Amino acid sequence: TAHTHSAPLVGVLMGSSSDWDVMKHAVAILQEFGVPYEAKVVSAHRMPDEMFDYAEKARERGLRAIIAGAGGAAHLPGMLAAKTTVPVLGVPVASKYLKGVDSLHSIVQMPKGVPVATFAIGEAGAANAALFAVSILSGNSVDYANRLAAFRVRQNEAAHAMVLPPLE
Amino acid sequence: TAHTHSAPLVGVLMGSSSDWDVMKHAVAILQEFGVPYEAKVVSAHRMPDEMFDYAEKARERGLRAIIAGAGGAAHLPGMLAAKTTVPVLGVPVASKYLKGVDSLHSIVQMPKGVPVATFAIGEAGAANAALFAVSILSGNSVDYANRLAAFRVRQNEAAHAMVLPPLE
Amino acid sequence: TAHTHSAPLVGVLMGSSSDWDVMKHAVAILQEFGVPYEAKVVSAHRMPDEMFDYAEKARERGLRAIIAGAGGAAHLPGMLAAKTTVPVLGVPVASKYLKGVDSLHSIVQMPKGVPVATFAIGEAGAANAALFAVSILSGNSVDYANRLAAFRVRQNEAAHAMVLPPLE
Amino acid sequence: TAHTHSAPLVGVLMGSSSDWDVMKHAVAILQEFGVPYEAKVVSAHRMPDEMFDYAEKARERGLRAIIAGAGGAAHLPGMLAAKTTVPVLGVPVASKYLKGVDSLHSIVQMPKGVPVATFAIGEAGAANAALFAVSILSGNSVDYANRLAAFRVRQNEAAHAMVLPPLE
Amino acid sequence: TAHTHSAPLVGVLMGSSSDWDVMKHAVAILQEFGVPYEAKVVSAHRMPDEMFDYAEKARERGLRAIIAGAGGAAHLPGMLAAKTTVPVLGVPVASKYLKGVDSLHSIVQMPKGVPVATFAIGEAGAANAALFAVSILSGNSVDYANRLAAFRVRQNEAAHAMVLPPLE
Amino acid sequence: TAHTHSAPLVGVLMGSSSDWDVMKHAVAILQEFGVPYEAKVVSAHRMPDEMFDYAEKARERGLRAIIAGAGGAAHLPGMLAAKTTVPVLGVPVASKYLKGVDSLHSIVQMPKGVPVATFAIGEAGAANAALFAVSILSGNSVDYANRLAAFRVRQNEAAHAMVLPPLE
Amino acid sequence: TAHTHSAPLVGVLMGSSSDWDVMKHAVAILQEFGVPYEAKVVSAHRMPDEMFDYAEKARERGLRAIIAGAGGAAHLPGMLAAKTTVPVLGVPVASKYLKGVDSLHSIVQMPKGVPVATFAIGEAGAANAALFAVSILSGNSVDYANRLAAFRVRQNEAAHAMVLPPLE
Amino acid sequence: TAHTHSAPLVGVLMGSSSDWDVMKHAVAILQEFGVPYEAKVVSAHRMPDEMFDYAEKARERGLRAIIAGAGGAAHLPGMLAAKTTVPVLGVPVASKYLKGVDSLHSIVQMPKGVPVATFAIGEAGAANAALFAVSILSGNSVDYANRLAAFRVRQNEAAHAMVLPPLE
């Protein structure tokens, strides 16, 4: 029901609904910016064929970026990237024991020929992958360009408004 | 004089000519794909004002991506991204002692609000940042989409042609 | 032409001929033990369809193990295992900067449901994956059990024969 | 009382009953698949002679795999493997301070001659060691082959059934 | 309101009020020692222009040290140091997933030309940056020299007064 | 009052009463084995002179081992060792952010000439340092030799008595 | 004979002449800036009394900073700082196996109460510790402030002069 | 033939003659101090039974310490310690890819009950393990106490004699 669109510009993928705690931060940004999007559970290891199918159809469906979150032996971003030339934006989800060090290594260290744009471990990287998608869309949209400029100014204002309290 | 253009679509920046050994791999991809580009030495720490000026002007100049390489306490990608909404693509350059672990941390771990798309440590990341820039351009260019598709066919063919010799 | 068989029991795969320096150590064990084998270049990222096709066909072809080596964002073992129930034996190949730490994380940290048996970084792991494949065959082969036992006696004798020289 | 069998095919060993929180996930898989098994506390450091005896007897008793978990200076899998040619499947149990990095290093880094198939840190690796054991058994059992294929399809269906909720 | 002065000798900066939990330990020391100080939220990424302005003005305002805390891709201390020759004292704030390893790398690994004096991860480093500031001021103040000597003796007395209880 | 003796054979030192949570495990072993001991707060950084004094007097007082715990930039074991030839047994106490990785590096990595026998991070290393002290004392005491032999047999019995419960 | 002064403002210390390859970079800066300095071999572990004597006398002798380099279990900076209130500037020297990771932990992770200002691993940190000492002197010297400003202009000019060559 | 004694006080063990490059540094100290010693190749994985036999016999043979070097999944020190109450002194030998990080984890992280005294990675640790053995013997030998004291005087004198040359 939720997170569907007939003409999405950004897809948000993850291997499990357990990743939603992190990946929902990507979706929050896309909603805030009014970007047509979809969010789907697509597992590299449990849904390998479906992963390949998604990547194959991405460009013809009009996707401009795929945001993909994964943890541990995190293969979903790199394997999507292997099967489409549409930009893939990888979000390392923190793992229980290695705290996303494994996730980060498995995503960022792509060999020459198949890039994955990688962001910070966890909720920061999820939000930033979405913001980065908006920066891609702003390359040919005054609306997204304007919204991103306004977002930065608002962020700057919010930092100015912060207050440090007296020592207790 | 080398690496200038009157209308670049991608800028390739680094803090020192010592970084060229890595960053030349990005320039090689841009030349191969026929992407108008510029390459410049812009140091976060020795040229802070110049860094800010470059980022300020990137959007009005028509840049569609800035590829930025740095090592150690690698601040150039993040501080460019702080000052422009043009996509910033960060390449960790390996450091002498920590082998780019410091570089990678310094670039990828950006807090929410100011994204840097991060690629592999070293030459692989430099080439991939450039290939990723081409994917960005392919969002609204059939020519760049076709060039990427042809590149991938060539890559696949080259992998098929590889040979494993007898044990010696 | 080198490294083919009409009825292999073990397949040795790697993403590039550059991995042969490590993966040849697996092939040496297989030859020593008289195990019918094939060795092939199959890249997760440059040959994704071919990788899936190889895994799909592994069981019907009679393969009892697939030894797969990869480095960096090492996806080949995990994605083979996503597509076959034949045992997959992963060999992390050392990477230029991270020395196989990235390779190891990328292979061993598979989530529940899709196992990869992982061995040491480099040449030791390649030789051990092959020796482990022989242990798998020894489950229902007295011949292979006997060969392993004889290998271990030779190993033990070789250790006993080692000599520690005078200080110089 | 629990976890005994007169003709086990898989042994599940650990140094302490404190390791049961992790290793019970191996036993759950073995039960689900109907694999005859035993689970025992066998400590490398507090029961060294008993560890040797277990390994010595494994093949003649009909064990096809030994799943062994250990944490810290984790020696149990490698020392079992030194004393039997039956497949040894090592599970790094996370340690209090190093979160299983020490465990992983102590298990996976076996030198050439004595392999240990290593799986992910913690409960994922325990479950996967057991799944891998089932894959070994499927090499000569249609029942285990069928059960494993059915398991994979069930996992795929479960991923398809996952739902991402609306933002709250 | 709080943490202002018309003639501060030490500035305490951080990217967010969320960093106060750590950086308040710097302020506690400055208060205890009677050092005129100010504390301000100045974000490298959300307030880049303001960061440059602060550094530009530091010497002429009479600042003798700037204590700056940041976490993750921690750029605030190094970018302040790029824009002033007043001593910059960097405090790595621990990050959620990497526990300040990223913070430390991003601060301490400055290349030749632009130093940042770096202290321990977290509250210990915040307190110590402030103590170090006092040591700088003691170079031309008998009052600060005396206070620092008295502090050290008091610390020594406090350690002498510690009691180890009986086993319970 | 507690943890004094007129003729101790082992001293247990730590920089703060906060280390007692860990170091009390050393004292528990020494009490169990009936070893004359003392435990004292001696800080490398807050009590440097007192640390040197303790080490200077150790041999003439009859100490046979000094167990020293420290965390972070952990200098107490190495500096005791610099000032006495009596065996120094170092226990890395886990730090808040780096979980004792820093503690371990600062203790174990002593250069040639001044050894520190180093044990596991935390309570395990504290207990083991004390057990190791007993092994030193057993070199010339049948009583300590016997007690250590009996301890090992009891440990073996305790491991035998462990029970793995049914799956719930 | 080399590296002495009757009235040094900065002392450069290291545990061995083998550290000179790194620490000479500090001395080069001090010479360039005309800072009266001394350089000495003072080992924490082989010369512990001498280290304490040096720290004790630092303040009365007029020293404004002590630059101290050490590697491995690097105790020299911290133990100097335990014994003087003169600013101590620590330089981690890379170690053979751990590449200065151990050195860095050992120096930077000082507990509250005894600060060490820590710089980058190796030659960069040595040069920066010296440049930081000049910043300390610039607090109450127009001459040293002027020299720093001129250094930064030269740095900036040198960066502008760098050239990126054609691809070969 | 080299490195034998009819009444050794220290045994120096390693899993391969390849380890001699490191372990010879221990033997050099033993020879210098006149300690009766033996050195042997005893492999945990290739000679498991022989390892157990050596440890079983160590105490009745009069050994006062066993120095054991190993790398990678380094089990030799721990498994010796599991089988004897004679002090075991572990030397991590650097591994090809992980540079002894694996070796160190595998040796130092022993659980409560079975201690291994651990020294630095490589040659420094081998020399120090031997020096530590001499400290053990010094507990009830005035000759060995005097030899250690003389060694330390020599070390101190050698440090004083070191010279720092002019800048080139």
Side-chain angles (χ1 to χ4, degrees), chain A residues 2-167, chain B residues 2-167, chain C residues 2-167, chain D residues 2-167, chain E residues 2-167, chain F residues 2-167, chain G residues 2-167, chain H residues 2-167:
Chain A
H3 314 300
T4 68
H5 201 285
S6 58
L9 302 181
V10 177
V12 184
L13 273 45
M14 67 216 70
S16 177
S17 54
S18 68
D19 297 320
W20 183 249
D21 190 23
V22 169
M23 301 307 293
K24 71 180 176 178
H25 294 273
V27 174
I29 292 293
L30 300 170
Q31 291 193 3
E32 173 184 343
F33 279 78
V35 178
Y37 79 96
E38 61 185 11
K40 282 180 190 165
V41 168
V42 171
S43 172
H45 296 138
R46 306 185 322 283
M47 301 166 60
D49 298 321
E50 295 88 338
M51 169 179 71
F52 271 29
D53 192 68
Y54 189 92
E56 279 174 7
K57 292 171 171 161
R59 188 179 284 280
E60 74 201 54
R61 289 182 62 227
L63 291 173
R64 294 284 299 280
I66 305 170
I67 299 172
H75 300 165
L76 168 69
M79 292 313 307
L80 289 162
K83 282 292 295 184
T84 183
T85 53
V86 169
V88 176
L89 315 184
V91 178
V93 174
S95 46
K96 173 168 183 188
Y97 300 109
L98 298 185
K99 310 295 189 294
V101 171
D102 52 354
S103 317
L104 170 63
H105 283 161
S106 304
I107 297 168
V108 72
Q109 293 288 90
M110 292 294 282
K112 173 184 174 195
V114 180
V116 170
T118 312
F119 305 81
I121 298 161
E123 33 280 272
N128 278 351
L131 285 167
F132 191 91
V134 174
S135 73
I136 292 180
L137 299 179
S138 69
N140 64 327
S141 168
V142 299
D143 287 345
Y144 291 124
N146 290 342
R147 287 172 199 172
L148 196 52
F151 174 90
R152 294 292 192 100
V153 164
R154 229 142 52 232
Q155 282 208 113
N156 173 268
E157 291 166 353
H160 272 279
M162 288 182 159
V163 174
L164 301 173
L167 283 190
Chain B
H3 315 299
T4 63
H5 204 284
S6 69
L9 300 180
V10 178
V12 186
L13 271 52
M14 62 216 75
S16 181
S17 46
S18 76
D19 295 320
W20 182 250
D21 184 33
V22 172
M23 302 308 289
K24 67 188 183 186
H25 296 268
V27 172
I29 292 294
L30 298 174
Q31 286 185 12
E32 178 181 344
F33 279 75
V35 179
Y37 81 92
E38 61 185 11
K40 289 179 133 289
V41 175
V42 171
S43 169
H45 299 131
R46 306 187 321 287
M47 301 167 66
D49 302 309
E50 297 87 338
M51 176 174 61
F52 272 25
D53 185 70
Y54 187 92
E56 282 176 359
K57 295 172 158 67
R59 188 175 273 278
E60 74 207 32
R61 287 177 70 223
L63 290 176
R64 300 281 304 278
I66 302 169
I67 300 171
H75 299 173
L76 171 67
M79 290 312 306
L80 288 165
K83 281 291 296 185
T84 186
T85 56
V86 173
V88 175
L89 316 183
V91 177
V93 174
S95 51
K96 179 173 176 175
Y97 299 108
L98 295 184
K99 304 304 205 301
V101 171
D102 48 359
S103 311
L104 175 57
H105 287 156
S106 291
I107 298 165
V108 74
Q109 291 291 92
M110 289 296 280
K112 164 172 165 186
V114 179
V116 170
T118 313
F119 304 82
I121 298 161
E123 317 79 76
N128 279 349
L131 284 168
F132 187 86
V134 179
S135 299
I136 292 170
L137 300 176
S138 84
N140 55 322
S141 172
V142 186
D143 288 354
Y144 288 117
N146 290 338
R147 288 175 188 170
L148 273 171
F151 175 86
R152 292 213 167 178
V153 171
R154 288 197 301 281
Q155 281 225 126
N156 177 264
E157 289 173 347
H160 276 273
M162 293 187 138
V163 296
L164 301 176
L167 297 186
Chain C
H3 315 299
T4 67
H5 203 285
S6 65
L9 301 179
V10 175
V12 187
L13 274 54
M14 62 215 75
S16 178
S17 49
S18 62
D19 297 318
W20 182 251
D21 186 38
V22 171
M23 301 306 292
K24 69 185 183 193
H25 296 269
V27 171
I29 290 302
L30 296 172
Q31 284 183 15
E32 178 180 346
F33 281 74
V35 179
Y37 78 93
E38 63 187 6
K40 292 173 69 61
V41 171
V42 170
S43 170
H45 299 134
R46 308 193 311 292
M47 303 171 64
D49 303 307
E50 297 89 337
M51 171 177 64
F52 273 27
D53 183 70
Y54 187 94
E56 282 176 4
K57 292 169 159 60
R59 185 171 278 272
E60 74 210 34
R61 291 178 64 228
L63 288 176
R64 300 286 304 278
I66 303 168
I67 301 171
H75 297 176
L76 171 69
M79 295 305 312
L80 291 163
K83 280 292 289 181
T84 186
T85 55
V86 172
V88 175
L89 313 186
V91 180
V93 174
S95 48
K96 181 173 179 180
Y97 299 107
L98 292 188
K99 307 304 193 281
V101 173
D102 52 354
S103 312
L104 173 60
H105 287 159
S106 289
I107 296 165
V108 72
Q109 290 292 95
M110 291 295 281
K112 171 175 160 182
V114 182
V116 171
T118 312
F119 304 82
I121 297 159
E123 306 91 294
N128 277 349
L131 284 167
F132 190 85
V134 176
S135 294
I136 294 170
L137 299 176
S138 81
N140 56 325
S141 171
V142 177
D143 266 10
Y144 289 118
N146 288 339
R147 289 176 189 176
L148 280 169
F151 176 89
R152 295 222 165 172
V153 174
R154 291 201 298 282
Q155 266 210 123
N156 177 265
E157 290 174 343
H160 274 277
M162 292 183 153
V163 297
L164 301 178
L167 297 182
Chain D
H3 315 303
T4 73
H5 202 284
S6 66
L9 303 182
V10 176
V12 185
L13 277 47
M14 69 216 66
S16 177
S17 48
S18 73
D19 297 320
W20 188 244
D21 193 29
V22 168
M23 298 310 292
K24 73 185 176 172
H25 296 264
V27 171
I29 291 290
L30 298 173
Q31 286 191 14
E32 171 182 345
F33 279 78
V35 181
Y37 80 97
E38 60 185 12
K40 292 189 192 171
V41 166
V42 169
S43 170
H45 298 135
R46 290 161 4 258
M47 301 168 62
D49 293 329
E50 295 90 337
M51 173 181 60
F52 273 27
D53 191 62
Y54 189 91
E56 280 175 2
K57 289 171 173 164
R59 187 176 287 275
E60 74 201 48
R61 291 180 63 228
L63 291 174
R64 292 284 299 280
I66 305 167
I67 297 174
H75 300 167
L76 170 69
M79 295 308 306
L80 288 164
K83 285 288 298 183
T84 185
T85 60
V86 172
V88 177
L89 315 178
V91 178
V93 174
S95 46
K96 181 163 175 190
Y97 299 108
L98 297 184
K99 313 301 192 294
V101 170
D102 50 354
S103 318
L104 172 59
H105 283 163
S106 306
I107 300 167
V108 73
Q109 293 289 90
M110 292 295 287
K112 171 181 174 198
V114 179
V116 171
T118 312
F119 305 83
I121 302 161
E123 37 280 281
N128 279 349
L131 288 167
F132 189 90
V134 176
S135 67
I136 289 173
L137 300 180
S138 70
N140 60 324
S141 166
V142 301
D143 288 340
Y144 292 123
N146 287 343
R147 286 174 200 169
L148 200 49
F151 176 88
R152 292 293 193 99
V153 163
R154 224 145 49 233
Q155 283 205 108
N156 173 273
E157 294 170 342
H160 271 279
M162 285 180 171
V163 173
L164 299 175
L167 289 188
Chain E
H3 315 303
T4 73
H5 202 284
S6 66
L9 303 182
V10 176
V12 185
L13 277 47
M14 69 216 66
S16 177
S17 48
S18 73
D19 297 320
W20 188 244
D21 193 29
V22 168
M23 298 310 292
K24 73 185 176 172
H25 296 264
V27 171
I29 291 290
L30 298 173
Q31 286 191 14
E32 171 182 345
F33 279 78
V35 181
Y37 80 97
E38 60 185 12
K40 292 189 192 171
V41 166
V42 169
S43 170
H45 298 135
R46 290 161 4 258
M47 301 168 62
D49 293 329
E50 295 90 337
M51 173 181 60
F52 273 27
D53 191 62
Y54 189 91
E56 280 175 2
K57 289 171 173 164
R59 187 176 287 275
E60 74 201 48
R61 291 180 63 228
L63 291 174
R64 292 284 299 280
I66 305 167
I67 297 174
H75 300 167
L76 170 69
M79 295 308 306
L80 288 164
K83 285 288 298 183
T84 185
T85 60
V86 172
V88 177
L89 315 178
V91 178
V93 174
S95 46
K96 181 163 175 190
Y97 299 108
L98 297 184
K99 313 301 192 294
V101 170
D102 50 354
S103 318
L104 172 59
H105 283 163
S106 306
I107 300 167
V108 73
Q109 293 289 90
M110 292 295 287
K112 171 181 174 198
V114 179
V116 171
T118 312
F119 305 83
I121 302 161
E123 37 280 281
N128 279 349
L131 288 167
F132 189 90
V134 176
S135 67
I136 289 173
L137 300 180
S138 70
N140 60 324
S141 166
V142 301
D143 288 340
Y144 292 123
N146 287 343
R147 286 174 200 169
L148 200 49
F151 176 88
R152 292 293 193 99
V153 163
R154 224 145 49 233
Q155 283 205 108
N156 173 273
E157 294 170 342
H160 271 279
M162 285 180 171
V163 173
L164 299 175
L167 289 188
Chain F
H3 314 300
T4 68
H5 201 285
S6 58
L9 302 181
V10 177
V12 184
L13 273 45
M14 67 216 70
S16 177
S17 54
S18 68
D19 297 320
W20 183 249
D21 190 23
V22 169
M23 301 307 293
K24 71 180 176 178
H25 294 273
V27 174
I29 292 293
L30 300 170
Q31 291 193 3
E32 173 184 343
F33 279 78
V35 178
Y37 79 96
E38 61 185 11
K40 282 180 190 165
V41 168
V42 171
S43 172
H45 296 138
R46 306 185 322 283
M47 301 166 60
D49 298 321
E50 295 88 338
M51 169 179 71
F52 271 29
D53 192 68
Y54 189 92
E56 279 174 7
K57 292 171 171 161
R59 188 179 284 280
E60 74 201 54
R61 289 182 62 227
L63 291 173
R64 294 284 299 280
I66 305 170
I67 299 172
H75 300 165
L76 168 69
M79 292 313 307
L80 289 162
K83 282 292 295 184
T84 183
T85 53
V86 169
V88 176
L89 315 184
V91 178
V93 174
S95 46
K96 173 168 183 188
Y97 300 109
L98 298 185
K99 310 295 189 294
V101 171
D102 52 354
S103 317
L104 170 63
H105 283 161
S106 304
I107 297 168
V108 72
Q109 293 288 90
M110 292 294 282
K112 173 184 174 195
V114 180
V116 170
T118 312
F119 305 81
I121 298 161
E123 33 280 272
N128 278 351
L131 285 167
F132 191 91
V134 174
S135 73
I136 292 180
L137 299 179
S138 69
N140 64 327
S141 168
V142 299
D143 287 345
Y144 291 124
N146 290 342
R147 287 172 199 172
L148 196 52
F151 174 90
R152 294 292 192 100
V153 164
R154 229 142 52 232
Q155 282 208 113
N156 173 268
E157 291 166 353
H160 272 279
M162 288 182 159
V163 174
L164 301 173
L167 283 190
Chain G
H3 315 299
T4 67
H5 203 285
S6 65
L9 301 179
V10 175
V12 187
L13 274 54
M14 62 215 75
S16 178
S17 49
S18 62
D19 297 318
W20 182 251
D21 186 38
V22 171
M23 301 306 292
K24 69 185 183 193
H25 296 269
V27 171
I29 290 302
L30 296 172
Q31 284 183 15
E32 178 180 346
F33 281 74
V35 179
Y37 78 93
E38 63 187 6
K40 292 173 69 61
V41 171
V42 170
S43 170
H45 299 134
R46 308 193 311 292
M47 303 171 64
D49 303 307
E50 297 89 337
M51 171 177 64
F52 273 27
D53 183 70
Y54 187 94
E56 282 176 4
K57 292 169 159 60
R59 185 171 278 272
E60 74 210 34
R61 291 178 64 228
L63 288 176
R64 300 286 304 278
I66 303 168
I67 301 171
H75 297 176
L76 171 69
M79 295 305 312
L80 291 163
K83 280 292 289 181
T84 186
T85 55
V86 172
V88 175
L89 313 186
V91 180
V93 174
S95 48
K96 181 173 179 180
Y97 299 107
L98 292 188
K99 307 304 193 281
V101 173
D102 52 354
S103 312
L104 173 60
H105 287 159
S106 289
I107 296 165
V108 72
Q109 290 292 95
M110 291 295 281
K112 171 175 160 182
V114 182
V116 171
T118 312
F119 304 82
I121 297 159
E123 306 91 294
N128 277 349
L131 284 167
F132 190 85
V134 176
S135 294
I136 294 170
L137 299 176
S138 81
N140 56 325
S141 171
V142 177
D143 266 10
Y144 289 118
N146 288 339
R147 289 176 189 176
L148 280 169
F151 176 89
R152 295 222 165 172
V153 174
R154 291 201 298 282
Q155 266 210 123
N156 177 265
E157 290 174 343
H160 274 277
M162 292 183 153
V163 297
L164 301 178
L167 297 182
Chain H
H3 315 299
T4 63
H5 204 284
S6 69
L9 300 180
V10 178
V12 186
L13 271 52
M14 62 216 75
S16 181
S17 46
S18 76
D19 295 320
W20 182 250
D21 184 33
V22 172
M23 302 308 289
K24 67 188 183 186
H25 296 268
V27 172
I29 292 294
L30 298 174
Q31 286 185 12
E32 178 181 344
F33 279 75
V35 179
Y37 81 92
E38 61 185 11
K40 289 179 133 289
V41 175
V42 171
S43 169
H45 299 131
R46 306 187 321 287
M47 301 167 66
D49 302 309
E50 297 87 338
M51 176 174 61
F52 272 25
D53 185 70
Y54 187 92
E56 282 176 359
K57 295 172 158 67
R59 188 175 273 278
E60 74 207 32
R61 287 177 70 223
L63 290 176
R64 300 281 304 278
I66 302 169
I67 300 171
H75 299 173
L76 171 67
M79 290 312 306
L80 288 165
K83 281 291 296 185
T84 186
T85 56
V86 173
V88 175
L89 316 183
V91 177
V93 174
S95 51
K96 179 173 176 175
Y97 299 108
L98 295 184
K99 304 304 205 301
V101 171
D102 48 359
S103 311
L104 175 57
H105 287 156
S106 291
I107 298 165
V108 74
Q109 291 291 92
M110 289 296 280
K112 164 172 165 186
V114 179
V116 170
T118 313
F119 304 82
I121 298 161
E123 317 79 76
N128 279 349
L131 284 168
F132 187 86
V134 179
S135 299
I136 292 170
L137 300 176
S138 84
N140 55 322
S141 172
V142 186
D143 288 354
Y144 288 117
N146 290 338
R147 288 175 188 170
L148 273 171
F151 175 86
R152 292 213 167 178
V153 171
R154 288 197 301 281
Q155 281 225 126
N156 177 264
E157 289 173 347
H160 276 273
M162 293 187 138
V163 296
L164 301 176
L167 297 186

